[PDB]
């Protein structure tokens, strides 16, 4: 992958810092050098996991576990774990193996495989290794390079995470949304100032910045060799995995981190509702009611779009702009129409065919969105938005403070069940199970091609 590049110097630096990290007591096992080597594994895994996404994180984790264990253990253990991983990749499935009272880990793995908890069977590799997973703060503080790439997809961001990290320690963030040539020269003068000032900075969507960063920022980073002695500024550039390829010298010079913190569905409703409502209401109780309804709908569609091919035949990206357009359309139709259930059908059609159906190009996905919209919007008398929450209509006295209070309370008190991916989303449990099956197949397969490569 283009982003997953690596340098010799990074490996040697991590190797050097393996030793002087005499932080946590290593396991009281064979000799000193063996535990030093195991600590080397733990350190390199902790450092280099942050540059890899969840799937690659997992495959590298298990492959590295196998690399350690095959060399450190007996032939029986090696062939048993080989049979286990073959069972995981049912394209190379075999017969399970049993070692009596010796390797409790393998019984746990076989239990996870049999119990259809494939994701737990995977995560066992990381859990057993007693690793110390990191966040942005740990990698930023511990690393010495001033540059960091804020890798993510086009549907989730760490901007709020970075802002709250700054507010947690030393602040100094200067969000610089790059854009037009005026935006361009403002950004370059800002970074020139921040080089001496040493304040934190953040640039948005380096992909669209491609020309400027190739011409200016790449050259500036090349020239900033001795300038790192200046006040301790933090360089944060947001890059998108599906975006255009970034120049190799720039990505190599900087440090890399990727974001995977996908908030829960209830969390999505929480933060979308808060960010939408803190600007103040416009019209009567029905306005905030339909705003709540469309916020929930946006949460469901954002949830469903993360599953491919189960649900949608292909991946889509729903930007907030759709949310603003939905809000504007609902506000306008409510202002135009009287306080009745009259415009529900037309609002549903408009949302499913223009606001959210415009991007989509598959009649199956159009039908899915249409049925979801009909379920969520059409109806009255305590609509069951999710099987665990009942949403009644606004009452006849039309007070909006009580409505906002009741909406916030019903959002807070209600809890999200673990099966929300299959319960809140109208998907058969077979669908999600086969999704986990496909995930296990792809990760495990890649792990074989890796291991036969060695």
């Amino acid at each position: 992958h283009w982003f997953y590049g690596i340098s010799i110097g990074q490996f040697l630096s991590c190797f050097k810092r393996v030793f002087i990290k005499k932080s946590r007591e290593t396991r009281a096992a064979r000799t000193r050098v063996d535990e030093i080597l195991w600590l080397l594994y733990q350190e390199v895994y902790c450092q280099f996991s942050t540059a890899l996404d969840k799937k690659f994180k997992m495959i590298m984790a298990m492959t590295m576990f196998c690399l350690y264990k095959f060399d450190i253990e007996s032939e029986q253990y090696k062939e048993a774990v080989l049979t286990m991983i073959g069972v995981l990749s049912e394209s190379s499935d075999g017969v399970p193996k049993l070692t009596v009272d010796t390797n409790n880990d393998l019984r746990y793995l076989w239990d996870y495989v049999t119990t259809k908890s494939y994701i737990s069977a995977l995560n066992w590799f990381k859990n057993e290794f007693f690793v110390d997973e990191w966040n942005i703060a740990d990698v930023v503080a511990n690393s010495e390079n001033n540059y960091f790439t804020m890798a993510s997809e086009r549907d989730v961001d760490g901007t709020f995470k970075l802002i709250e990290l700054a507010k947690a320690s030393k602040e100094s963030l200067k969000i610089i949304p790059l854009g037009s040539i005026e935006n361009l020269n403002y950004a370059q003068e800002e970074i020139s100032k921040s080089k001496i000032e040493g304040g934190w900075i953040l640039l948005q969507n380096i992909q669209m910045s491609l020309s400027w960063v190739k011409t200016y920022l790449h050259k500036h980073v090349e020239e900033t060799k001795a300038a790192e002695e200046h006040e301790k500024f933090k360089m944060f550039m947001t890059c998108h995995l599906t975006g255009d390829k970034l120049p190799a010298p720039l990505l190599q010079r900087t440090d890399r981190f990727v974001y995977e913190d996908i908030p829960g569905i209830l969390d999505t409703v929480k933060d979308l509702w808060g960010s939408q409502f803190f600007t103040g209401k416009i019209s009567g109780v029905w306005s905030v009611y339909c705003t709540f309804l469309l916020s929930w709908f946006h949460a469901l569609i954002t949830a469903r779009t993360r599953l491919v091919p189960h649900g949608f035949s292909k991946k889509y990206y729903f930007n907030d702009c759709d949310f603003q357009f939905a809000s504007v359309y609902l506000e306008n139709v409510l202002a135009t129409n009287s306080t009745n259930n009259i415009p529900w059908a037309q609002v549903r059609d408009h949302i499913a065919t223009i606001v959210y159906g415009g991007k989509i190009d598959e009649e199956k996905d159009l039908e899915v969105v249409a049925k979801l919209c009909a379920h969520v919007f059409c109806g009255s008398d305590n609509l069951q938005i999710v099987p665990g929450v009942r949403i009644p209509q606004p009452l006849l006295q039309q007070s909006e403070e009580e409505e906002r209070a009741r909406l916030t309370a019903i959002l807070s008190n209600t809890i999200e069940p673990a099966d929300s991916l299959s319960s809140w989303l109208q998907l058969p449990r077979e669908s999600i199970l086969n999704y986990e099956r496909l995930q296990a197949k792809e990760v495990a397969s890649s792990t074989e091609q890796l291991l036969q490569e060695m």
Partner: protein
């Protein structure tokens, strides 16, 4: 890159006089000095280089140390893991 104007020096080609050393370069019998030293530096190793220089010029690998690895991390370990006897040997 390579042009056959330094050809008369990449391969020994000098019409020495009785007491003066001359080389036919371009259109001038350019003067030479005993302290003149020329060294060709390359940017990347993957790029193909002309065969004539490979015949003549003395290639030396200062390339990035991807291979081996054992030597570098071995040096790091000896300088780091109980270094006293290792560098006391050099002492």
């Amino acid at each position: 890159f390579f042009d056959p104007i330094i050809s008369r020096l990449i391969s020994r080609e000098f019409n020495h006089a009785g007491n003066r050393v001359t080389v036919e370069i371009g259109d001038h019998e350019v003067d030479v000095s005993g302290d003149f030293k020329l060294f060709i530096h390359s940017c990347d190793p993957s790029g193909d280089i002309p065969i004539f220089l490979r015949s003549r010029v003395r290639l030396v690998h200062f390339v990035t140390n991807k291979e081996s690895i054992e030597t570098r991390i071995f040096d790091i370990t000896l300088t780091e893991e109980n270094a006293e006897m290792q560098r006391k040997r050099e002492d």
